Amino acid sequence: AMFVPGPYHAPEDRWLVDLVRGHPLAQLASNGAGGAAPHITHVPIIVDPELDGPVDRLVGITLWGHMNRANPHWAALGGAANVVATFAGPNAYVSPAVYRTAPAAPTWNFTSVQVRGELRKVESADDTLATVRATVAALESRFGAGWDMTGSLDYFRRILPGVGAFRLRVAEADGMFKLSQEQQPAIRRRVRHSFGGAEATRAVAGLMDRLP
């Protein structure tokens, strides 16, 4: 359901899980009614926080998300919507100047995970509050500064009615790791070296370093 050329497959299933954890603000897409363009909403999605033990594969697990119930996308999902959620990681423009070869064409290195399955809306106030608390736990740990939600739990309950929490059972998962694997080894090394020298591109260089 996602087109990934052979050379851009992750070396291990765990790479797709690592991208979802590192880039939780996903683009959630569902079909537009009457041949209209898809609905797209940026939503915070995490892996099922009740999974204990290493999560090596996305297929078969449940993701947890929320959006604004007042967003018209929530009404458009209906009951049993087949959805895609796209997670986008590190990326960078590849200048052929870096290759020091000729002839050439530029490209864009990038990382994507597309997960597909059925979206189920959460109606339970308990499950909705679990969703947003788990999201805080996961994102404050990875991206934040040790903020303690304990003193804000009453506030969470006060604004809870606006939350559209959901569950996405992952039927299909595809990962684009477009990282110059199509180039000859010395050229891949020149790209990696070039991306090492600047903050905007170091995370791409980091992934290129981890390919077998």
Cα separation, 56 vs 65, in Å, equals: 20
Q: Which of 51, 97 has the CB closer to a second copy?
A: 97
Contact pick of 17, 98, 163, 168 for ligand HEM (by CB under 6 A): 163
- Helix, strand, coil percent content, the chain, rounded in steps of 5: 35, 30, 30
Contact window for a second copy (CB under 8 A) among 45-53, 81-89, 122-130, 185-193: 81-89
132 lies in the binding site for ligand HEM (CB under 6 A): yes
Within 10 A of 131 (CB to CB), how many other CB atoms are there? 23
- The one-letter code for the residue type at 84 is V
Using CB under 6 A as the binding rule, whether residue 107 contacts ligand HEM is answered as yes
Q: Does the annotation place 68 within a ligand binding site?
A: yes
> Which of 59, 107, 120, 130 is close enough to bind ligand A1ECN by CB under 6 A?
107
3-state SS of 68-111 is ECCCHHHHHHCCCEEEEEEEEEEEEEECCCCCCCCCCCCEEEEE
Residue 155 contacts a second copy per CB under 8 A: yes
Dihedral sign computed on CA atoms, order 14, 17, 21, 26: positive
Among 105, 123, 158, 199, binds ligand A1ECN (CB under 6 A): 105
Per rule CB under 8 A, is residue 197 in the interface with a second copy? no
**Residue 182: how many other CB atoms lie within 10 Å:** 13
Query: Distances from the Cα of 133 to the Cαs of 24, 96, 112, 136, 193, in angstroms?
Result: 15, 46, 26, 5, 41
Please give the residue ranges that form the binding site for a second copy (CB under 8 A): 1-3, 5, 25, 27, 29-32, 35-42, 44, 68, 70-73, 82-84, 86, 88, 91, 93, 95-98, 102-106, 108, 110, 112, 114, 116-117, 132, 136, 139-140, 143-147, 149, 151-152, 154-156, 159, 176, 194, 199-200
Please give the residue ranges that form the binding site for ligand HEM (CB under 6 A): 3, 41-44, 66-68, 71, 105-108, 132, 135-136, 139, 156, 159-160, 162-163
